[PDB]
mmCIF file of C-alpha atoms and ligand atoms in Angstrom:
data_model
loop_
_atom_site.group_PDB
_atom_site.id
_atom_site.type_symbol
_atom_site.label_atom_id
_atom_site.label_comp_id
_atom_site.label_asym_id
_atom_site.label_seq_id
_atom_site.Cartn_x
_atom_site.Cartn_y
_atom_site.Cartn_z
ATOM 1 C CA UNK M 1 -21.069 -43.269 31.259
ATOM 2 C CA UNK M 2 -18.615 -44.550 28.542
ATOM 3 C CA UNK M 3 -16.769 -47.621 27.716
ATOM 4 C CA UNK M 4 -14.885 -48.397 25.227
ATOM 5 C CA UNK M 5 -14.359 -52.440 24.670
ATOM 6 C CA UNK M 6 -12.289 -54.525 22.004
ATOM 7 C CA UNK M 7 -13.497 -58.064 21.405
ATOM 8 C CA UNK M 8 -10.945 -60.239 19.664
ATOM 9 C CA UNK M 9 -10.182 -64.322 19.968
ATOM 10 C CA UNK M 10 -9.665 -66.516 16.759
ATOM 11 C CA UNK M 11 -11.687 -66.801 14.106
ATOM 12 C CA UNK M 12 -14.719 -68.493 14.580
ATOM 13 C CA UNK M 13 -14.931 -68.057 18.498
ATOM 14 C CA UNK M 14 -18.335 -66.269 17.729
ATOM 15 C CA UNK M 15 -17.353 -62.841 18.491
ATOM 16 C CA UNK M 16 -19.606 -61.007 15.423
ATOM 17 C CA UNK M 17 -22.439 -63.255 16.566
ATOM 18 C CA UNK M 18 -22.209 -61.968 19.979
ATOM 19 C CA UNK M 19 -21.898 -58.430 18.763
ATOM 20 C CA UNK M 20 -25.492 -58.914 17.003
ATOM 21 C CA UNK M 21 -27.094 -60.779 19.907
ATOM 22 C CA UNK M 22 -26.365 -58.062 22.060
ATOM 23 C CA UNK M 23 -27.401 -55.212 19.847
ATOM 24 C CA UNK M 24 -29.829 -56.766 17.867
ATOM 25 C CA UNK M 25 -31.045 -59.349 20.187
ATOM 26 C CA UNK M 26 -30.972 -62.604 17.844
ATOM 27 C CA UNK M 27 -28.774 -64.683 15.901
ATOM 28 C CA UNK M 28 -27.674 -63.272 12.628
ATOM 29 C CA UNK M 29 -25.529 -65.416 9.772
ATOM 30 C CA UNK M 30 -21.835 -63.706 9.570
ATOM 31 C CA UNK M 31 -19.214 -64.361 7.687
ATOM 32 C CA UNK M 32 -15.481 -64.229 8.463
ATOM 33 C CA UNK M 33 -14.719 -60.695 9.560
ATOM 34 C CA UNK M 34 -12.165 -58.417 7.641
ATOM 35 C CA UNK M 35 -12.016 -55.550 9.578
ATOM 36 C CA UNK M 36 -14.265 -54.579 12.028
ATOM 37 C CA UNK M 37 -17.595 -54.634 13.186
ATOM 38 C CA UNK M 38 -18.554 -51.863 15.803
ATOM 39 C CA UNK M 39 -21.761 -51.265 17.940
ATOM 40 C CA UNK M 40 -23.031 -49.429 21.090
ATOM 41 C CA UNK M 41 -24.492 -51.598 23.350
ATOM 42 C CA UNK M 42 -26.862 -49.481 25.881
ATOM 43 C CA UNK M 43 -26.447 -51.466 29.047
ATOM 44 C CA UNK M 44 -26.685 -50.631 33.259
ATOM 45 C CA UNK M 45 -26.809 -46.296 31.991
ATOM 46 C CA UNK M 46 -23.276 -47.466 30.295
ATOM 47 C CA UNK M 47 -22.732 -46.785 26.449
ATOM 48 C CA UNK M 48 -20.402 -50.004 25.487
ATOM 49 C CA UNK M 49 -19.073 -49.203 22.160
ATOM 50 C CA UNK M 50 -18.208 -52.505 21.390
ATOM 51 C CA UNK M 51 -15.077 -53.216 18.398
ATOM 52 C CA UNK M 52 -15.654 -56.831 17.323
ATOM 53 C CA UNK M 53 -12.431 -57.476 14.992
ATOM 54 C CA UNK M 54 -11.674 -60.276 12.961
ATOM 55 C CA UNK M 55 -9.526 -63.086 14.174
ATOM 56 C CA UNK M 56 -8.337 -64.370 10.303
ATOM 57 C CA UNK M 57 -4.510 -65.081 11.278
ATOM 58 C CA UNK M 58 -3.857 -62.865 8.187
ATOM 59 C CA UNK M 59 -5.225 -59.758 9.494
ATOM 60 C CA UNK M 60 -4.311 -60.303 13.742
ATOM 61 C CA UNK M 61 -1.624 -57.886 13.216
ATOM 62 C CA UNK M 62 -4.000 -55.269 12.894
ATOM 63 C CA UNK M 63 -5.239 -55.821 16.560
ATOM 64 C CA UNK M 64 -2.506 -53.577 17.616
ATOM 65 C CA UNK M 65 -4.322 -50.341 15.632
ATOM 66 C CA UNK M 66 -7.123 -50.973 18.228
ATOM 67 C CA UNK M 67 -5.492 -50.995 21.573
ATOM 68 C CA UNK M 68 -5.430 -46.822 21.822
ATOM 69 C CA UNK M 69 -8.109 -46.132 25.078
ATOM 70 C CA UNK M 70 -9.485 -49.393 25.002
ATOM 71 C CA UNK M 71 -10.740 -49.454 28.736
ATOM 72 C CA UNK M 72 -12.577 -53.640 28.527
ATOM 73 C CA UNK M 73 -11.306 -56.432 26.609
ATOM 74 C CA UNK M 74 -13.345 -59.305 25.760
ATOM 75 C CA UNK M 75 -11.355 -62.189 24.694
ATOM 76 C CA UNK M 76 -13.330 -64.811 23.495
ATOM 77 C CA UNK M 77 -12.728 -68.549 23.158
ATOM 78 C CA UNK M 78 -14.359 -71.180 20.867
ATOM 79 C CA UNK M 79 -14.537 -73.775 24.107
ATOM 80 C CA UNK M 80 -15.518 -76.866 21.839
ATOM 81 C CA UNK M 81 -12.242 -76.273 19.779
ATOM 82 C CA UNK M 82 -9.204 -77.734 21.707
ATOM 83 C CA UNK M 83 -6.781 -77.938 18.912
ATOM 84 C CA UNK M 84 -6.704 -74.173 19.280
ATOM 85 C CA UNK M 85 -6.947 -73.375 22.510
ATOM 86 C CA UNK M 86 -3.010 -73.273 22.907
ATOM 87 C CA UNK M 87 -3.285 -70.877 20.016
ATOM 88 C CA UNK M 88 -5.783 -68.515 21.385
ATOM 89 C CA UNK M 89 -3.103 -68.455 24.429
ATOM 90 C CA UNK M 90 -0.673 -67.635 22.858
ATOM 91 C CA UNK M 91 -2.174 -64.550 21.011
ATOM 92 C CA UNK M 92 -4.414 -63.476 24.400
ATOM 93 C CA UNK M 93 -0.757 -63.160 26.177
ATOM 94 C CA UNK M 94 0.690 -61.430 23.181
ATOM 95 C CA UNK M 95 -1.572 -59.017 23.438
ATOM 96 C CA UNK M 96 -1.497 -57.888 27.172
ATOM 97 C CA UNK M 97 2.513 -57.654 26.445
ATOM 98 C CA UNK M 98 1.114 -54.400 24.995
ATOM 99 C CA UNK M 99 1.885 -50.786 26.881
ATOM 100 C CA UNK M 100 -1.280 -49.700 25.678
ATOM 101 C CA UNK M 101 -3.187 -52.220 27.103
ATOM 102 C CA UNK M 102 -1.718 -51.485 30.747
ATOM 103 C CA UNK M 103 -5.261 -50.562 32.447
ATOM 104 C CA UNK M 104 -7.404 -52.559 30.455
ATOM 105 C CA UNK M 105 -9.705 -55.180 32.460
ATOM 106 C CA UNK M 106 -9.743 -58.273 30.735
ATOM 107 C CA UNK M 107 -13.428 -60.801 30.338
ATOM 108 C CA UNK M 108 -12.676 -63.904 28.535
ATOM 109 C CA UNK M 109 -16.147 -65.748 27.362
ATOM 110 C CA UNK M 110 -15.894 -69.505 27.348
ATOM 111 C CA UNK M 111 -18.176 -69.419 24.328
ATOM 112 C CA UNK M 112 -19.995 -72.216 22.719
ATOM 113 C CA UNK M 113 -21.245 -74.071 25.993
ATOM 114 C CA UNK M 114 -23.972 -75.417 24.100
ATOM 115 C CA UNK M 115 -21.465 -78.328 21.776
ATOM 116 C CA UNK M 116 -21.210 -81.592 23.553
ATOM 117 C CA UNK M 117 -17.882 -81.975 24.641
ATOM 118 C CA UNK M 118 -16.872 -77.994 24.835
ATOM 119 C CA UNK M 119 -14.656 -76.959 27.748
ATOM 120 C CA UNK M 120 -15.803 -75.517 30.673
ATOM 121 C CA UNK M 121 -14.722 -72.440 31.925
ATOM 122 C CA UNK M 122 -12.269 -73.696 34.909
ATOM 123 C CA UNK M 123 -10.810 -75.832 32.173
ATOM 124 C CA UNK M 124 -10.285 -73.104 29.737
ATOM 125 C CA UNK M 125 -8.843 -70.677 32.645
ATOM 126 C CA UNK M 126 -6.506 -73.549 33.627
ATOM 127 C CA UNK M 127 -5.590 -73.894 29.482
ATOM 128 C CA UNK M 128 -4.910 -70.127 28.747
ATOM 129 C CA UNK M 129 -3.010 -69.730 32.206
ATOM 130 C CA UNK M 130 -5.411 -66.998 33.594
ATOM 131 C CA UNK M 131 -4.649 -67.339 37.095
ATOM 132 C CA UNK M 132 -0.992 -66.458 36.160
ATOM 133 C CA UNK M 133 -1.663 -62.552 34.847
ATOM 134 C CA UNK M 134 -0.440 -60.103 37.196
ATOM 135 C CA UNK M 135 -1.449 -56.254 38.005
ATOM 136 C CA UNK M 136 -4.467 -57.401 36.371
ATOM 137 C CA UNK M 137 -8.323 -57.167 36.988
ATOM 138 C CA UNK M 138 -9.620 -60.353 34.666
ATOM 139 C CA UNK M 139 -12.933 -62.679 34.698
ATOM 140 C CA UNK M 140 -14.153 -65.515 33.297
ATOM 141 C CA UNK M 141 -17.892 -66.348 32.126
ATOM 142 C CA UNK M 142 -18.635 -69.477 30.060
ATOM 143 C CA UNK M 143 -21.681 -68.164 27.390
ATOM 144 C CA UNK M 144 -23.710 -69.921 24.761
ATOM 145 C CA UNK M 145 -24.461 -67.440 21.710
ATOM 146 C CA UNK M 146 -27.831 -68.775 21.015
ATOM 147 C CA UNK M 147 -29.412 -68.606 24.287
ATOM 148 C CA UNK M 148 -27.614 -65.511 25.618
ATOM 149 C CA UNK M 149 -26.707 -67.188 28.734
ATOM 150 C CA UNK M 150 -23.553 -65.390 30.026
ATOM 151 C CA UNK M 151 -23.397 -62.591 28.268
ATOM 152 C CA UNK M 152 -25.057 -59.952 30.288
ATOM 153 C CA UNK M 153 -23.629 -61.443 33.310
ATOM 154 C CA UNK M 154 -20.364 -60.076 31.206
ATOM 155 C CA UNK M 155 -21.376 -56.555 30.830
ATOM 156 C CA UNK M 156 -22.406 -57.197 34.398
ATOM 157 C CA UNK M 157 -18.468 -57.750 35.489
ATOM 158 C CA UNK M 158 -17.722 -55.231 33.334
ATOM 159 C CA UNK M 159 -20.198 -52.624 34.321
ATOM 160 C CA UNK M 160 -18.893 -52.928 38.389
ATOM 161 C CA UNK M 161 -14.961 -52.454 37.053
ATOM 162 C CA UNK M 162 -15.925 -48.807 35.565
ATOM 163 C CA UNK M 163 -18.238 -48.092 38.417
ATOM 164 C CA UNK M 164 -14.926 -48.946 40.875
ATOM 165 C CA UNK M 165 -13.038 -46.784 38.880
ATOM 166 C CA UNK N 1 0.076 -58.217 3.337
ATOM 167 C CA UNK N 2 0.366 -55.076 5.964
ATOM 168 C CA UNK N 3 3.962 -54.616 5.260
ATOM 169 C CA UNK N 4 4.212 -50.743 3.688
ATOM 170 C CA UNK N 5 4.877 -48.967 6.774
ATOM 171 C CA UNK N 6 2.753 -45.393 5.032
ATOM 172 C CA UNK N 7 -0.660 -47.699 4.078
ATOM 173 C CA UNK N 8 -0.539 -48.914 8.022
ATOM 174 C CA UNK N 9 -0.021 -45.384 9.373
ATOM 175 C CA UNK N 10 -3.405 -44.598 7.042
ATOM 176 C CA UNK N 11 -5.149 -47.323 8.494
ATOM 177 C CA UNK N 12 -4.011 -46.729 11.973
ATOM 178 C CA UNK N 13 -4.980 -43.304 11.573
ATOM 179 C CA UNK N 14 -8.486 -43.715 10.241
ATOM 180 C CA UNK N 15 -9.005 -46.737 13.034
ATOM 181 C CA UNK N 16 -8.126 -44.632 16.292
ATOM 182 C CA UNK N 17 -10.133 -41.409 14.203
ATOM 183 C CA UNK N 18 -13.646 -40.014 16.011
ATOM 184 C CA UNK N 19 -15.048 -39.518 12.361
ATOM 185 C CA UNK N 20 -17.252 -41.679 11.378
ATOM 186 C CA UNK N 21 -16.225 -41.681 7.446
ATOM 187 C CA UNK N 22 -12.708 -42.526 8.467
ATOM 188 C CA UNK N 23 -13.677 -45.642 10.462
ATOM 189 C CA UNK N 24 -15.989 -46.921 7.352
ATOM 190 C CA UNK N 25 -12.466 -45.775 5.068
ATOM 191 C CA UNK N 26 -10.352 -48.243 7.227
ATOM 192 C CA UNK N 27 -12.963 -51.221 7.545
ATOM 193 C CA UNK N 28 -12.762 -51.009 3.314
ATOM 194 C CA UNK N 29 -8.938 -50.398 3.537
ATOM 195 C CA UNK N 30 -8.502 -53.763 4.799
ATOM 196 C CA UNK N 31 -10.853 -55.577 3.194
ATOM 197 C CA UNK N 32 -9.465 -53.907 -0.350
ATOM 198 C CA UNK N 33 -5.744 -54.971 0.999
ATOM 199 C CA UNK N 34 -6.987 -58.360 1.734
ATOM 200 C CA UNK N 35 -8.666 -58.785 -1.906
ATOM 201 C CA UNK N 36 -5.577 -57.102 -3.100
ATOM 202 C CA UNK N 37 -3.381 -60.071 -2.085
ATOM 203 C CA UNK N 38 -5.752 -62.754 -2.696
ATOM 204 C CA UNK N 39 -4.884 -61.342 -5.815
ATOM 205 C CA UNK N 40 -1.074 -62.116 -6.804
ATOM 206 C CA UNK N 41 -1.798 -65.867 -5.869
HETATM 207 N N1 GTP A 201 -22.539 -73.993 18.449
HETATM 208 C C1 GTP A 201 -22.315 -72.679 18.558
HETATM 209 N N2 GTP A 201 -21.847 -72.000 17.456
HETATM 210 C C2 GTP A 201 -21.640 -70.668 17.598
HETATM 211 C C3 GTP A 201 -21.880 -69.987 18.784
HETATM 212 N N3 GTP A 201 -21.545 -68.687 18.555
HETATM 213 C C4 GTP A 201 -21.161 -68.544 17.271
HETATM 214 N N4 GTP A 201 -21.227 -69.779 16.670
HETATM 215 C C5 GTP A 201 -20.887 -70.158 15.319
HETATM 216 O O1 GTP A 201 -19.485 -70.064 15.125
HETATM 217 C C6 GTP A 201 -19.195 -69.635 13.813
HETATM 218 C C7 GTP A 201 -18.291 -68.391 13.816
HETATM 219 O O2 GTP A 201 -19.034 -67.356 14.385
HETATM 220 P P1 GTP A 201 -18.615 -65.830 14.135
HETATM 221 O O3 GTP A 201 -19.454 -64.964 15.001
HETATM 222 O O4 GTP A 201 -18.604 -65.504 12.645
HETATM 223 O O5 GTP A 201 -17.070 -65.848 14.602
HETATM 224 P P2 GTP A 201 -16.044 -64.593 14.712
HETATM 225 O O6 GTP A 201 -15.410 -64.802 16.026
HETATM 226 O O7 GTP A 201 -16.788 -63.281 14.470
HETATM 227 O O8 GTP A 201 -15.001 -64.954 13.557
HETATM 228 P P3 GTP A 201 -14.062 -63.859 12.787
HETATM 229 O O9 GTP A 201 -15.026 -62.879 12.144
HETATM 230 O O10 GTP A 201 -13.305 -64.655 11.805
HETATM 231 O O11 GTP A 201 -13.166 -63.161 13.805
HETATM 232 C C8 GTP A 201 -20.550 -69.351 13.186
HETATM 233 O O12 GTP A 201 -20.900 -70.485 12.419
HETATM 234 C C9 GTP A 201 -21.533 -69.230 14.312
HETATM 235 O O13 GTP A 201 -22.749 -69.800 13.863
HETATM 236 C C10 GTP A 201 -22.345 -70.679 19.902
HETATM 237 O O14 GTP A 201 -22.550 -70.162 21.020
HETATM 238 N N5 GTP A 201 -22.543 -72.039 19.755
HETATM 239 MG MG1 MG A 202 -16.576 -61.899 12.944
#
């Protein structure tokens, strides 16, 4: 099986050094991301081709040319950084305005659990208004980069969604 | 930066495209456009 996921969030939530944890297995160093990064991630007999995309305010209105068929998005949060989390809301609920995005699940990664005083993940559900998205399937699973912790148990959630259709 | 309506149908084009060489043409696009107006400061 297939499945075809876009991972977006601001920049500097952490999504390139997720990409390369899951593919590679470690922790590369990145730098800000214009473009794209893309990867298959082998996981559960699923091929996740995985479209990390830079979160740069200058280039978010290209998220849009990466909607078409996308079938998982993983939204993913900086949790330490609370003068953006507002922010992040406001561009997570622009985006599932979208048509295109109808059908798409939606797993938001409360990333960053490792800092001191980051968020945890009922907080940052309560701050980005999760529980008020209708006619759509969505999870939550607070991660830490480093260790990997959460991050299967994402593909996980997102591995039963295709399976259920 | 984006705003010529043609360059974005290239790039949205060579984005949604199953061709490898037009997904590596589009991850360049942007990063040339980006240059291009960090340029013109
Ligand atoms: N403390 C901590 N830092 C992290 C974690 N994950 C990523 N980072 C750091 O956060 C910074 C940004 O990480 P990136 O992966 O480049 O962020 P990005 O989301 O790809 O950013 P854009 O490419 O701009 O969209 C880097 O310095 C990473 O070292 C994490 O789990 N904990
Ligand atoms: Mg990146």
């Amino acid at each position: 099986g297939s499945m075809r996921i876009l991972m977006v969030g601001l920049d500097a939530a952490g999504k390139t050094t997720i990409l390369y944890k899951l593919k590679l297995g470690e922790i590369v160093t990145t730098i800000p991301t214009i473009g794209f990064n893309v990867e298959t991630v082998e996981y559960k007999n699923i091929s996740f081709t995985v479209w990390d995309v830079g979160g740069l305010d200058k280039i978010r209105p290209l998220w849009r040319h990466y909607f078409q068929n996308t079938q998982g998005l993983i939204f993913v949060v900086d949790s330490n950084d609370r003068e953006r989390v507002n922010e992040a809301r406001e561009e997570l609920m622009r985006m599932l305005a979208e048509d295109e995005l109808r059908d798409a699940v939606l797993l938001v990664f409360a990333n960053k659990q490792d800092l001191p005083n980051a968020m945890n993940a009922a907080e940052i559900t309560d701050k980005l208004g999760l529980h008020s998205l209708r006619h759509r399937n969505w999870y939550i699973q607070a991660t830490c980069a480093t260790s990997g912790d959460g991050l299967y148990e994402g593909l996980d959630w997102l591995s039963n969604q295709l399976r259920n259709q | 930066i984006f705003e010529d309506e043609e360059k974005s149908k290239m790039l949205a084009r060579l984005l949604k495209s199953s061709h490898p060489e037009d997904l590596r043409a589009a991850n360049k696009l942007i990063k040339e456009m980006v240059q291009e107006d960090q340029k013109r400061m």
